[PDB]
Amino acid sequence: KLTKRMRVIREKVDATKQYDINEAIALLKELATAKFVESVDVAVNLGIDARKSDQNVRGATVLPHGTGQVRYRNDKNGIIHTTIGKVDFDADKLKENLEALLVALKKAKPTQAKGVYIKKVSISTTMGAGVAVD
Amino acid sequence: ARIAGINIPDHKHAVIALTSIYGVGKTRSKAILAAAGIAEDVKISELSEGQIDTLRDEVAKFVVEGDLRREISMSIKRLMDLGCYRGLRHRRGLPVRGQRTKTNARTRKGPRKP
RNA sequence: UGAGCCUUGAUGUGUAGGAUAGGUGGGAGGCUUUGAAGUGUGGACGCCAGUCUGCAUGGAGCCGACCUUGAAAUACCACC
RNA sequence: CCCC
RNA sequence: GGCACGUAGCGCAGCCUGGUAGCGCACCGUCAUGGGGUGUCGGGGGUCGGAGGUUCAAAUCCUCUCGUGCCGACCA
Numbered sequence: 001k002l003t004k005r006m007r008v009i010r011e012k013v014d015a016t017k018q019y020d021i022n023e024a025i026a027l028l029k030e031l032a033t034a035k036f037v038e039s040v041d042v043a044v045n046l047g048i049d050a051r052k053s054d055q056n057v058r059g060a061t062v063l064p065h066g067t068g069q070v071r072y073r074n075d076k077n078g079i080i081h082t083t084i085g086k087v088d089f090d091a092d093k094l095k096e097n098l099e100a101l102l103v104a105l106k107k108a109k110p111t112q113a114k115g116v117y118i119k120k121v122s123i124s125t126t127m128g129a130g131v132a133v134d
Numbered sequence: 135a136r137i138a139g140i141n142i143p144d145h146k147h148a149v150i151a152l153t154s155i156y157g158v159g160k161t162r163s164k165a166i167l168a169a170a171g172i173a174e175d176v177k178i179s180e181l182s183e184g185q186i187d188t189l190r191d192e193v194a195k196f197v198v199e200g201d202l203r204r205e206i207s208m209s210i211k212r213l214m215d216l217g218c219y220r221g222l223r224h225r226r227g228l229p230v231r232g233q234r235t236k237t238n239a240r241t242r243k244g245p246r247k248p
Numbered sequence: 249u250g251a252g253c254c255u256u257g258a259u260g261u262g263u264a265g266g267a268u269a270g271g272u273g274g275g276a277g278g279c280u281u282u283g284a285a286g287u288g289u290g291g292a293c294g295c296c297a298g299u300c301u302g303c304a305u306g307g308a309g310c311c312g313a314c315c316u317u318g319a320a321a322u323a324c325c326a327c328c
Numbered sequence: 329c330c331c332c
Numbered sequence: 333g334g335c336a337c338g339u340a341g342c343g344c345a346g347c348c349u350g351g352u353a354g355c356g357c358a359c360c361g362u363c364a365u366g367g368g369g370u371g372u373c374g375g376g377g378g379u380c381g382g383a384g385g386u387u388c389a390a391a392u393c394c395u396c397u398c399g400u401g402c403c404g405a406c407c408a
């Protein structure tokens with residue numbers, strides 16, 4: 001159904017096993033199979049019901065290592081597309097770039113939230129099987 | 135193409151553009167092209183401006199758009215001044231060309247309301 | 249035998265207009281020989297307009313950007 | 329269908 | 333607290349399940365008939381109870397509100 005490429009990268013991760021932070025920065029060389037500076041996307045699953053006008057999010061990220069000042073905004077259903085950078089930008093520094101992202105959000109945590117704000121952080125790759133960390 | 139200032143009678147024959155001009159009709163165009171010395175077998179897109187300004191000068195002898203409706207309105211103000219039957223009828227917004235009014239004037243009196 | 253549910257399968261005619269296109273949206277190389285585009289046809293959905301899969305003949309060839317769209321392609325990837 |  | 337009704341004069345679809353107020357009765361003027369009705373034919377007649385937001389746009393989504401219901405709860 002596929003070529004040799006797509007299958008071995010899906011057989012290098014686990015979706016039923018929600019990976020961890022320090023375990024996450026080992027596999028993005030096995031999740032990077034492109035002949036350029038390929039990107040790595042992040043998704044943030046959220047824990048509010050945004051069907052109400054009061055729950056829009058909007059802000060800019062001061063990147064601790066640049067890429068770099070990127071804006072963001074949540075979704076109406078609870079999953080926002082963000083980014084940490086690329087796969088070659090010092091994977092070990094990618095964890096420290098994951099650090100600075102989310103601590104800025106809980107500071108601007110909206111007061112009209114219902115339930116828990118965050119749900120899950122998927123540090124996924126652009127050309128491989130995603131990773132959903134707690 | 136420019137005659138009269140505002141009207142563009144493009145691709146109209148020499149006298150057809152003048153019949154289609156604002157102010158005059160069927161025979162005054164023939165009269166204009168006879169007083170100016172031009173034939174009526176070609177469109178306006180072939181005659182140069184050396185004669186179009188002459189046509190616009192020659193048509194400057196009749197009543198034009200700005201005085202057409204204003205002479206009409208001077209007459210209508212004479213109607214609003216006198217009080218005669220055609221002032222009374224005209225002051226009720228009623229059709230425009232003769233005498234019969236009872237049973238059939240419906241196009242210019244509008245459709246039936248109820 | 250319904251309910252909740254992971255994986256997978258798989259999904260939501262607008263008109264515009266290459267285009268059955270969900271909210272975003274990182275994104276320009278995937279694709280390719282663990283064995284092409286066109287076709288040979290059994291099956292699925294269908295407002296049946298089109299999406300589209302098993303074994304293949306063909307067997308190594310297309311495309312993101314490339315134009316008109318409230319929208320760009322679901323090329324990869326992302327959680328629902 | 330009603331009625332003269 | 334908890335869910336169900338508001339849509340032309342009347343009864344409702346659509347509903348308080350997404351893009352474009354529709355059906356029936358009522359009313360007006362025709363046609364149908366020797367005279368009438370049913371019937372076909374057109375025309376008015378409402379902006380979805382009110383407000384506020386999401387939209388490429390609400391009626392059809394969400395919040396408050398209004399009138400009416402029904403279940404339940406209620407030890408200044």
Ligand SMILES: [Mg+2]
Pocket residue numbers: 227228229230239242243
């Ligand atoms: Mg009259």
Ligand SMILES: [Mg+2]
Pocket residue numbers: 332
């Ligand atoms: Mg008899």
Ligand SMILES: [Mg+2]
Pocket residue numbers: none
């Ligand atoms: Mg009491």
